[PDB]
Amino acid sequence: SLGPQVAEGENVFGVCHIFASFNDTFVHVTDLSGKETICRVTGGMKVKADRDESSPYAAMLAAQDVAQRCKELGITALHIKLRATGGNRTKTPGPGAQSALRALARSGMKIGRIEDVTPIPSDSTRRKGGRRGRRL
RNA sequence: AGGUCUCGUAGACCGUGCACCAUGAGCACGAAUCCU
């Protein structure tokens, strides 16, 4: 797992798909094409209590672990690909995206272009729930 | 030739629902104008 390239002149790029719902966050790193992956730790991996799996703490620890693994293998520059749960459920990102991005930037890498790739439907099927909604 | 262009720095709109939560015996109440 070594590479005889230059390090001072330029940097090696990858992309990171940050998928964040209201109950779990994902920090997934692939190559530029996206077929081949590098590392993934989810927000339920760090905390052992499944209540706050979408906490900023678990997203911060997962982003720090992903950045440590990427520095171990040799990825320095990274393109952010932000995604919520999408569909017809909601479009607001979950409560770990900003914390994971700040932890990933503070770890000592380089950030390129931030992109929102949440699936926006053009009038898809019926949303889950009744006509009166979830009354609680 | 001068080597920090000028006048003060709300520069908080981080976010979302929120465990279980029922009932109450009736007797005890009367409606008003003017001075020697």
Side-chain angles (χ1 to χ4, degrees):
Chain A
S1 304
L2 302 174
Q5 72 263 7
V6 67
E8 188 60 46
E10 66 174 279
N11 54 5
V12 191
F13 270 89
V15 305
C16 180
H17 319 277
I18 300 175
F19 165 61
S21 67
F22 291 165
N23 47 6
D24 210 32
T25 187
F26 277 72
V27 185
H28 197 107
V29 164
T30 61
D31 72 317
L32 276 297
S33 62
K35 176 174 289 143
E36 182 65 26
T37 78
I38 306 287
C39 49
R40 153 167 59 114
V41 297
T42 76
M45 272 186 140
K46 287 315 169 201
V47 298
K48 274 309 282 182
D50 63 309
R51 184 177 179 179
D52 46 9
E53 281 164 345
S54 68
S55 66
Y57 187 35
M60 185 201 75
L61 293 175
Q64 282 176 351
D65 186 74
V66 162
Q68 195 267 340
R69 173 65 175 203
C70 277
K71 294 181 176 67
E72 175 179 359
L73 183 63
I75 292 172
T76 54
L78 183 63
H79 281 322
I80 301 299
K81 275 278 181 203
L82 173 61
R83 180 180 181 255
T85 195
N88 44 7
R89 286 180 192 171
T90 180
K91 278 88 174 183
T92 310
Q98 293 82 17
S99 179
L101 177 73
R102 189 174 184 173
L104 183 63
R106 273 280 301 146
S107 291
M109 293 177 71
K110 298 305 157 53
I111 311 296
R113 296 211 145 82
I114 319 186
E115 184 67 27
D116 192 0
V117 303
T118 183
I120 303 299
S122 164
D123 303 282
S124 68
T125 69
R126 279 191 70 97
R127 196 187 146 144
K128 188 268 183 182
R131 192 199 161 79
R132 287 180 282 157
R134 31 177 304 151
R135 312 155 303 278
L136 74 164

